[PDB]
Motif scaffolding. Structure first.
Motif: not given
Lengths: 122, 122
Positions: B67-88
């Motif tokens: 939504l803000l900052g650099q939109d590139e593929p690695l930050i997406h994989v990092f975010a998923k790995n970091l907080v998928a468990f929060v959402s689940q």
């Protein structure tokens, strides 16, 4: 690890236009995050960013973008009037505003700026 | 009305892979806001929410949006790995992540998740 900067936050809950409202302000190096939440809702996210450089005789123009939630003209007006002073007093840092306020009025906005002032972190 | 919180927030500062890291987790009706900050920066804002095509993997695959900052593929994989468990765990609530991590690593990612656990607000 010497000279790690502190991420500074301050919050207050106050009844605003009759409604219990929590405000939190958190200072980052590029942004002040301002969270205004009623009835536990995260609300709409608005980015407010300076789009010109400040001078002795002018304040930066602020551009607003709704990042998440209801993108309506009123929210842009509301956000700008709510936190322009935060950007200007915080060195022309951008503001990230999460605002969940159902009933927007000039009355509530001025009351909210006072709560923001109490939660100053810049 | 008292000056007391309407939404629950927990924070913790921890040295992670040598870098002092401030984590704050706040629970809203439909979102968990997670802030992971190093070097005083707000970092990339990333929304994460269960896919709508995502059916019966008991954990939906997540849709990620910078939504803000650099939109590139690695930050997406990092975010998923970091907080998928929060959402689940959070009742499949959406997650809004503000993440500023200078050097991502498997070790760092795993350690960061433990700090988020310590800030559980769900």
């Amino acid at each position: 690890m010497e000279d790690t900067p502190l991420v500074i936050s301050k919050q207050k809950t106050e009844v605003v236009c009759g409604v219990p409202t929590q405000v939190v302000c958190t200072a980052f190096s590029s942004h002040i995050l301002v969270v205004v939440t009623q009835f536990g809702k995260m609300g709409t996210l608005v980015s407010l960013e300076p789009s010109s450089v400040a001078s002795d005789v002018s304040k930066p123009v602020l551009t607003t973008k709704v990042l998440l939630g209801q993108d309506e003209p009123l929210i842009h007006v509301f956000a700008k009037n709510l936190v322009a002073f935060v950007s200007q007093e915080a060195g022309n840092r951008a503001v990230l505003l999460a605002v969940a306020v159902k009933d927007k009025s000039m009355e509530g906005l001025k009351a909210l700026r006072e709560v923001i002032r109490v939660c100053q972190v810049w």
